[PDB]
């Protein structure tokens, strides 16, 4: 900190008002649009859909 | 055929003598699962 802390960045950007959408890994590098993309590198629910 | 023989869609003159409630046909298809 002080600037390095992500809380200060969130307060400055105003995203704290909508922090409910805080994605795991929200940082300056590799924001949600990239964190979600990378998470795909980490389909078998065997659900029974009604094909009507 | 022999027994039957022993007893005894109009088409144009040029086509003769020649070779011839909105449900889908297959509702409720098999439930292929995510597997």
């Amino acid at each position: 900190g002080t600037g390095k802390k992500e809380k200060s960045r969130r307060i400055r950007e105003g995203d704290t008002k909508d922090g409910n959408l805080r994605v795991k890994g929200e940082n300056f590098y590799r924001d949600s649009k990239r964190v979600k993309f990378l998470n795909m590198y980490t389909f078998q629910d065997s659900t029974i859909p009604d094909a009507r | 055929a022999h027994e039957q023989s022993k007893v005894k869609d109009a088409l144009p003159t040029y086509l003769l003598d020649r070779e011839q409630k909105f449900s889908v046909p297959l509702p409720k298809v098999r439930g292929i699962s995510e597997e």
Side-chain angles (χ1 to χ4, degrees):
Chain A
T2 65
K4 286 196 155 161
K5 290 176 172 195
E6 270 285 338
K7 281 203 192 154
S8 303
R9 198 214 98 265
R10 197 187 308 146
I11 292 156
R12 172 168 57 266
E13 279 173 8
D15 192 55
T16 180
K17 186 174 149 67
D18 293 327
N20 307 286
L21 184 41
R22 268 196 82 263
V23 170
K24 205 173 182 209
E26 170 262 352
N27 308 96
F28 163 76
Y29 321 94
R30 297 211 278 98
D31 214 46
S32 63
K33 253 69 204 285
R34 213 155 181 199
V35 163
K36 296 206 173 200
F37 168 44
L38 278 163
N39 290 346
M40 96 194 193
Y41 294 116
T42 57
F43 288 112
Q44 268 79 30
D45 292 359
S46 191
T47 187
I48 307 100
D50 191 46
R52 220 176 294 280
Chain B
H2 161 80
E3 287 177 281
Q4 292 294 280
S5 69
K6 172 59 193 207
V7 178
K8 283 175 175 185
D9 191 6
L11 291 165
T13 61
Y14 49 88
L15 295 193
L16 44 78
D17 314 321
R18 310 280 198 166
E19 188 169 318
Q20 288 86 244
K21 209 170 174 175
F22 293 86
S23 314
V24 287
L26 289 163
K28 179 40 171 176
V29 190
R30 177 157 51 98
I32 308 304
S33 291
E34 166 171 323
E35 67 189 316

